């Protein structure tokens, strides 16, 4: 068995470029890699499929026009270790969005539209060692002051994250700015 419109290499399931609007409900119990690249998904639903595939370690949802993830969608999915979310349309990052992924080591948010990050959004991720945040228009004001000091703390590749709003600090590395310059004046999320 293998989802009708996908391809199955070993424990790898490839449903890339199949024009999917929602993730196939019948994914084998032993899938290790799930590739849903180049589809038309829209947003991750909270039905708990992920927390139900105990062997899923890598999940790819690149180029899917994603503009959000329903709350508690990765609950029970402590197995996942790699999440490819590059090239989507996410603008905000909630704190009940990555809840459950405390074993995740890699998160790619490259080239999305993230401009603000809610406090406590990445704390649920104990194991993170790689965070790709390049090509994201971060709004560096009073609202993201907490986040700046969070990157320089956890200590990572920095995420390659840069400011894309405060004209002055534009194109500058979030981590390269003291929370003292992170001031809004005359929003966030």
Domain map (residue ranges) of the chain: 1-189
Q: Ramachandran region of residue 183, left (φ > 0), alpha (ψ -120 to 50) or beta?
A: beta
Distance of alpha carbon 172 from its chain centroid, rounded? 22
Q: Which residues pair with 163 in a beta bridge?
A: 138
The H or E element that residue 117 is part of is strand 116-117
The H or E element that residue 82 is part of is strand 82-84
Size of the chain, expressed as the number of residues it contains: 189
Residue-wise DSSP of 19-37: --SS--S---TT-SEEE--
- C-alpha span between 37 and 39 (Å, rounded): 6
- C-alpha distances (whole Å) from 54 to each of 29, 49, 131, 165, 184 are 7, 10, 23, 41, 44
Closest CA to 126 of 78, 86, 72: 78
The listed CATH number (3.80.10.10, 3.40.50.2300, 3.10.20.30, 3.30.460.80) that belongs to domain 1-189: 3.80.10.10
Resolution (A): 2.8
- Write down the experimental method used for this entry: X-ray
């Amino acid at each position: 068995d293998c989802p009708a419109m996908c391809h199955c290499e070993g424990t790898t399931v490839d449903c890339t470029g199949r024009g999917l609007k929602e993730i196939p409900r019948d994914i084998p119990l032993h899938t290790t890699e799930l590739l849903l690249n180049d589809n038309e998904l829209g947003r991750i639903s909270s039905d708990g499929l992920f927390g139900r595939l105990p062997h899923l370690v890598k999940l790819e949802l690149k180029r899917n026009q994603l503009t959000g993830i329903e709350p508690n969608a990765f609950e029970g999915a402590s197995h996942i270790q790699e999440l490819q979310l590059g090239e989507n349309k996410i603008k905000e990052i909630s704190n009940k969005m990555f809840l459950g992924l405390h074993q995740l080591k890699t998160l790619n948010l490259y080239d999305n539209q993230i401009s603000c990050v809610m406090p406590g959004s990445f704390e649920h991720l104990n194991s993170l060692t790689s965070l790709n945040l390049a090509s994201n228009p971060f709004n560096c004001n009073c609202h993201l002051a907490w986040f700046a000091e969070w990157l320089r703390k956890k200590s990572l590749n920095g995420g390659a994250a840069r400011c894309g709003a405060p004209s002055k600090v534009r194109d500058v590395q979030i981590k390269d700015l003291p929370h003292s310059e992170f001031k809004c004046s005359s929003e966030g999320c």
